[model samples]
Target: MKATGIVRRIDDLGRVVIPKEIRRTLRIREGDPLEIFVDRDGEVILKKYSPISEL
Candidate 1:
């Protein structure tokens, strides 16, 4: 797991702004859907979702 060397603080409303670079690299848009998961080791995972699967 490589870190992006960036850290963000969550606001009172539990919102942490995702950095622009990360968003661009991941191709995330303003209203894109994201799936969140928590592992057994307490690691948080975020992924983009697709409506259909090919193959």
Candidate 2:
């Protein structure tokens, strides 16, 4: 599916909602694991749990 990037604003509680379509396709159920990283430029990157060598 064609997708576009989105800019999201985190709430006061630091909560952000992922779109249902993306969540479903990635099988990101509640309590699922999310990996977060901060690059050299201080950018936040996130990905669903995957047993990849990089992780």
lDDT values, one for every candidate: 0.64, 0.63
* RMSD each, Å: 3.2, 3.4
Per-model TM values vs. the true structure = 0.64, 0.58
Give me the candidate number with maximum lDDT.
1
What digit string (tens of lDDT, one per residue) describes model 1 on residues 1-55?
6578666677889665777677688676786655577667845566665542121
lDDT of 2 at 20: 69
Residue-pair clash count for candidate 2: 0
| Runs with alpha carbons beyond 4 Å of true place in candidate 2 | 1-3, 52-55
Candidate 2 lDDT by residue in tens digits, 1-55 = 2555766798789756776666677666665566677657856655675643165
Q: List pairs with backbone clashes in candidate 1.
A: none
TM-score of structure candidate 1:
0.64
